[PDB]
């Protein structure tokens, strides 16, 4: 028995913002998801295709783990089928998703009383996002008829706005650290069993 | 928790030489390691932040580099006012664990 690093993705001093989440491919485990299930600090533990009380009696191939920071009122858009300004331009889950979306309140760290402008989120895009696709294209949208040449102005519209985080916003505008496991069973031997 | 052993346990040099401390991690801490300097029974001082950058106030010879799990702190043209104890301190995963520290003394 050797447990496998759920402690590197759940215990981190800095999650990346939602326009560039960090994917951590976890493989060759004997994992324990019931430690996650019986922690009593997660405000949203919703599994979407596996029975969560019986997570140890299954073997997958690769257990991916995305992680980002969004507002509390926008963790409804980290469900399969729901859309919005996060689920289509920042992080899009498929409709045949088989995983568990985990989140908790994180107002201790990600909020500073003058503002914490380090977390960004994408504002618009030319189209929507296919499932599990990130877009680090931080450049001027350039509407109109003139090239902006890298400034912001009348027809430029820089597409990354900052989360203005404070300890006084409301419970729904406080930062919720989301981590979404994505189980996968492709045609291969199975390693992550439990 | 992440442990940071430091090789060797102590140094012994003379002024005007180039030294090299080392703080080898356990897991992968992507440049989230800071270096300190503590003398005998006083508060430590910050030396370099995020394992490659540098703060204002320190002299121009405390410069360290490295990423991954192995980091090095290197002083060139060491003086007789820089002997003491030097600690590293990770910041990636909780809880933040410091190292046991190398003792830089003079022959």
């Amino acid at each position, epitope marked *: 028995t050797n447990l496998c690093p759920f402690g590197e993705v759940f215990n981190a001093t800095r999650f990346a913002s939602v326009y560039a989440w960090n994917r951590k491919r976890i493989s060759n485990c004997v994992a324990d998801y019931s430690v996650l299930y019986n922690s009593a600090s997660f405000s949203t533990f919703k599994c979407y295709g596996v029975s969560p009380t019986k997570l140890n009696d299954l073997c997958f191939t690769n257990v991916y783990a995305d992680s980002f920071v969004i507002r509390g009122d926008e963790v409804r858009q980290i469900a399969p089928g729901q859309t919005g300004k996060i689920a289509d331009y920042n992080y899009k889950l498929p409709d045949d998703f088989t995983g568990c979306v985990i989140a908790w309140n994180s107002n201790n760290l990600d909020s500073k*009383v003058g503002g914490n402008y380090n977390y960004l989120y994408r504002l618009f895009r030319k189209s929507n996002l296919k499932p599990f696709e990130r877009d680090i294209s931080t450049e001027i949208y350039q509407a109109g008829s003139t090239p902006c040449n890298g400034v912001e102005g009348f027809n430029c519209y820089f597409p990354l706005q900052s989360y203005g985080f404070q300890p006084t916003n409301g419970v729904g505008y406080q930062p919720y650290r989301v981590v979404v496991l994505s189980f996968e069973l492709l045609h291969a031997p199975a390693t992550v069993c439990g | 928790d992440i442990v940071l052993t430091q090789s060797p346990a102590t140094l012994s040099v003379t002024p005007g030489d180039n030294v090299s401390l080392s703080c080898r991690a356990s897991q992968i801490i992507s440049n989230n390691l800071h270096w300190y300097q503590q003398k005998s029974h006083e508060s*430590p001082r*910050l030396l370099i932040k995020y394992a490659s950058q540098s703060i204002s106030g320190i002299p121009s010879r405390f410069s360290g580099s490295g990423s991954g799990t192995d980091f090095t702190l290197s002083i060139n043209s060491v003086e007789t006012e820089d002997f003491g104890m030097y600690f590293c301190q990770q*910041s990636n995963t909780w809880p933040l664990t410091c190292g046991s*520290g190398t003792k830089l003394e003079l022959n």
Partner: nanobody, 119 residues
């Protein structure tokens, strides 16, 4: 000036509770956190756990889970440390270091109150 002057040294016997103050000055208090560092004579720096400077909600290390409490007073700028039921293992120096809410490097340190315990 930017400094964090603490109280003086203590002298307790096993069974009592000691209290160490750490008064911040010069900078605006609710920008960064406050971290506590214990150093026994002949050992490295063990991070005791930080405290938010707006709400006062602490976050203890798992080693110093019981017997410790980071209370915070906000009328005066002062963060306390209450060590309950002193044993002979808590003979050390106790710095308070200004660690950030986004950086977590210990920029400005205090002085240290060498709490010693004997019969």
């Amino acid at each position: 000036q930017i400094q964090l002057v603490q109280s003086g040294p203590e002298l307790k016997k096993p069974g009592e509770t000691v209290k160490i103050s750490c008064k911040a000055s010069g900078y605006t208090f609710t920008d960064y956190g406050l971290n506590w560092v214990k150093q026994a004579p002949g050992k490295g720096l063990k991070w005791m756990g930080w405290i938010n400077t707006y709400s006062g909600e602490p976050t203890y290390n798992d080693e110093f889970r019981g017997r410790f409490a980071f209370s915070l007073e906000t009328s005066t700028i002062t963060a306390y440390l209450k060590i309950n039921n002193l044993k002979n293992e808590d003979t050390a120096t106790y710095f308070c270091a200004r660690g950030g809410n986004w950086d977590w490097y210990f920029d400005v340190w205090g002085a240290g109150t060498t709490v010693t315990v004997s019969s």
